[PDB]
């Protein structure tokens, strides 16, 4: 009913139905507002399943788009007044919730949480970073391939001739952390993104330029319950992509667009709760509950499999490389930023939580968050102890005992394989089905293949004169 | 009278008289509003027949334009207020309805339906798809020929240098199914098309980007009675073409503009009715009446001849090729999307119908719809049983029994020849005359010849070094 | 031994081993002269079969290259002295003669001729025509396709600006038949081709410019026994291609490179003989033997199947179109140049023969000639009477009885299908195996598909605004 009044209040002409595919990309279809009736909400609208990658095959194409009336929000970019309504994908007749629908999967995972009685709500606070460029060009054909990035902030443009003169105040390599404008050219744009994000229901905590030259930026938003947060991530990306477009830029959430400067990560802060109390505060290490520790143990035990969802691109592994600040060591600490799991030191026990650092923004919200949870729960159910916190150092020196302690997957294939083998913790509660998992893996292997099979420019530098 | 009041209400300065030629192209002529009087409606206006392709020859040029007052609608693009009035082409004196007038032919077919008493109204719900480009160039002369397509969405432009930078968020090949903007660059335009379509009497159900890269799009409209729907198709195309033009684009309803990506089809949903009840619902397969099955049998029996009207271009056959999703297998099913006849699975028996998938948007509304009907009726009158539904697979593997089951025509010539031989079902009720059919065939053979006789670029690749 | 002396006489450094693939394209591999020993001639050299299209598959790759010492001839273009030796492809161990080797097939056919005792030698006098251009450009990708032809003789260049001025004496469209230079710009080149052809063993009868503008030309060579003539065709093409290249031109034997002007044909004059007497001279029509007539009957009966070898490209059918001089009517005559079979009127009965006009230069020598023979023999063995000679007119007016008399295939697919069904006459004597035929058909269907599936530039002209 709230929806039917929003239609009149904003004189809506269209309703934009949205959903996410397996890869994590928001999709949409539009219907005139006059097509929204009572039926619409109880039985949804029909659409072809076979069209989305990794979904229904040759025989069972048709499926249901079920509008979730709680998600109604006005689109701030479209020319004609239109209302966005996120939808779940349900199996026809049964109206159950498609095994391969990432939002259904995430909901199932929140259900299973309540069911085990371990807690009643999961809290996710992801920190996606991104880049804002002016020009992005790439291609690949039989005779070669290339990628060219360009932005007014790129340090390389210190020598570029410009029509009205080079005004040259640019962030150097790894020198983007906070120079005030004009070095930072994105203040106005970061704020528009903030205002718009809030007009769309998100709550912004801060915004700032990130480390890399050439437009790395970040908008920090307040956490929320798992599934609602993944929804927020989708909106977040949408706002970022579109505000950038409107400003004459182009944004990307790729994890490592440039060799030699910062990649973009999506740290995930998590904590559990029951009847308003934070199940993660306690007397153990850094203010943690023993539940938190088991959770951590779970995440560490299933890290490589989580990688397949939290770092789902070959590019993801160009960020997760033996570097200093590389969040690749499977350990926890409240200081050592070598550890992929940081423990925020905060006063109020109400805010005690863990920060899993290896995820990147390419990750499917839904599936990434879900896999993080399930690993945590399995860590609890099986009281998987974390061991002791690493407070020493990262991957380089150490190099004492060859420092072969836990680490995240080193390639996408490896992560996919881990997901293959270590799938039980995900199938728990019937959240993830084998079919879903196998389909996801197949989609990504096809991507992994393109990169493995196509000659790399660097290979010419290294081997043309062989 | 309603017309004469619309003239005053909108301060109309002109009346744009419209009609369609044999090929399916809407035509027009304009007269000042002050030329609209009582006479106009009862006796129409005179015009030269010999000017339209495939119409009157050397001796009998003059014919009548009969305004159909029910079709009055304001043109939303012209600068000066003008009212559009669709017209039928009548033989002078007799005022009968020209044998070769596609609208008259379609009306005759609706009449014959009522006459046989099989039903009192036919329902058509076509789904024309189309492409929106930025640049289209082509030519052919003695020294060569070419065609060049270009659009900001084309995947090939991932490498193109642009004045203000390449913002690069483009739908990859076969990757247009629903990425939200900015990947989908046509939201605003699809909605203007919707709003305008509705201002012109159409009822829109949905709009979305289609599968192909480079601007394939679709506006779904509500079905209507056969002849009124063909009228709607013409308006639909008009709106699409002109809104595109106003937005700096160029739209085409060609069936296969690009090799390697989706073509554009025009699926046709059909059903019959009498005194408000759906003659297609029943206890037989998937909720069908035995009448529906005979109809299907008719369509299948006369498929190749229908092709000559539903796929009237050589280009049409570049879409209908042994592909996976190619709607080329003459069979029905509620799932197998290899079958050119899908049976929508819907709850309300009031909405039971069949979907003939092989038609393309190049088809003349009128003649295509009519041929579909006549084939259906002949399927009924002669209780032509469908056989059993194909629920196995498409054209490739199968490949067991060489899988030579029914198929649609494989070339325009073949389709024209089928139409030649299998014309009886069309002549039924005096709907289609031999002269009309022979004239249509002659028009298309001339087109078929251009393509058969002109060297193809690929022939050089294949045989220049022979 | 003659070969071993040619090696010393010309101080040969290399031996270029040549052969032809199924499509008809000459192939080669080179070995130092010092690799030529006694063994070489008796056991040949080994090579990978799987590399040539339509040959050995996954398991049986290796085959034998058997040098035919009778074919030794010096290459007139290579920089270092090299001797060309044509080779047959033999099955290893058995040393039989590969079923799919076109030269072996042609030899088998000459054998079968002698075996039936019908005659002891077959005489072939083909007349391949060709084009000489300056620039040829073409391509096809997802966004389009094109072909651009250019030559200093092209009539279209009457308006072109040239660096040193346009000297403008060019052959107009269809106006190339014999204007003396400078209109004819290829006298010097046609003669070099002649001299070189003769240095390579061919005997030249004449050379002249052909009908089409833009460099159509022809070098007429003396007939020879079937297999030796096909060898000559290969050499002929080689000389043409390479002399053109050396003169800064580019030659093509494609049958119809331009719409609107002459295509290139390869008329085939044939006759049979026994113990020096011409089995084709007689008292019947135009000086023919009844044997000749049965031969003609055979050719006419199996025309469509022969087409698959004599007109093996989709392009071939752009030459064979209802035109005036189009050699498409399956009939004979000594005058009517509408007839695909002309009977040369000559005095000496020693020179009596038939001229089958529909072949084009794209045809595989071997397979085309062989198919022509086998059809002729089957015409004899089964005394297939020709019927009466057509002396009336071609395809247009006539148009009396709709003039549906015999005609050659109208498309490649049709020809391939005919070859499929009408294969018996080819399998006779074990000359053609089913496997060979099926493989050939598969190679060409793949080619036919490219053309059928790729949008044609003309389709845009005809249907973009549909």
Residue numbers in the entry:
A (entry chain L), B (entry chain G), C (entry chain A): 3 to 468
Give me lines lifted from the publication on this model.
By fusing monomeric MBP to dodecameric GS and progressively deleting residues in the junction, we generated a series of MBP-GS constructs that assembled as chimeric particles sufficiently large for cryo-EM analysis. GS forms a dodecamer with 6-fold dihedral (D6) symmetry and possesses a sterically accessible N-terminus. These observations are consistent with chimeric particles having a central double ring of GS subunits sandwiched between two rings of MBP subunits, confirming the successful scaffolding of the monomeric target.
The side view for Δ2 is characterized by two distinct features within each MBP layer, whereas that of Δ5 shows three such features. These observations suggest a configuration in which the MBP and GS subunits of construct Δ2 are approximately aligned along the (6-fold) axial direction, such that adjacent rings of MBP and GS subunits stack with an eclipsed geometry. To obtain a higher resolution cryo-EM structure for MBP-GS construct Δ2 we collected a larger dataset, used an electron-counting direct detection camera and performed 3D classification. This led to a new reconstruction with an overall resolution of 4.2 Å (FSC = 0.143 criterion) and a local resolution that varied from ~4 Å within the GS subunit to between 6 and 10 Å within the MBP subunit. A good fit was also observed for MBP: the N- and C-terminal lobes enclosing the active site are clearly defined, several helical elements are well resolved, and the bound maltose ligand is partly visible. Strikingly, the observed position of the C-terminal MBP helix deviates significantly from that predicted by extending the N-terminal GS helix with ideal geometry. This deviation corresponds to a 60° rotation of the MBP subunit relative to the position expected if the junction formed an ideal helix. Distortion of the intersubunit helix relieves the steric overlap and permits favourable contacts between MBP and GS, which stabilize the MBP orientation and thereby extend the D6 symmetry from the scaffold to the target. For one construct (Δ2), the 12 MBP subunits within the particle adopt the same orientation relative to the GS subunits to which they are fused.
